Amino acid sequence: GGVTTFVALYDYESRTETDISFKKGERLQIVNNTEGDWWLAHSLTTGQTGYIPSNYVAPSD
């Protein structure tokens, strides 16, 4: 298996119908896979669920 939890490296403001906003430091779990530029994610911090830009996160605890 792959990375369990990712951390936001930057703030991100939602701009679509299917993405989510998140703040730097939020912990996010990827739902499908990490293929592509947009990952379906769930914020463990806020409970939000939606797509995030993959270059805004990195593996974390």
Curated annotation (Swiss-Prot):
Tissue: Expressed to high levels, and with a high degree of kinase activity, in certain fully differentiated cells such as neurons, platelets and macrophages. Isoform 1 is widely expressed. Isoform 2 is expressed only in the muscle.
SH3 domain boundaries: 1-61
Protein's cellular compartments: Cell membrane; Mitochondrion inner membrane; Endosome membrane; Nucleus
PTM comment text: The phosphorylated form is termed pp60c-src.
Domain of life assignment: Eukaryota
Family as reported in the entry's similarity comment: Belongs to the protein kinase superfamily. Tyr protein kinase family. SRC subfamily.
Role, per record: Non-receptor protein tyrosine kinase which is activated following engagement of many different classes of cellular receptors including immune response receptors, integrins and other adhesion receptors, receptor protein tyrosine kinases, G protein-coupled receptors as well as cytokine receptors. Participates in signaling pathways that control a diverse spectrum of biological activities including gene transcription, immune response, cell adhesion, cell cycle progression, apoptosis, migration, and transformation.
Subunit structure, as described in the record: Forms a complex with polyoma virus middle T antigen. Interacts with AFAP-110. Interacts with GJA1 and PXN.
Stated name of the protein: Proto-oncogene tyrosine-protein kinase Src
Naturally occurring in which organism (per UniProt): Gallus gallus
Gene that this sequence comes from: SRC
Residues of the full protein shown: 81 to 141 of 533
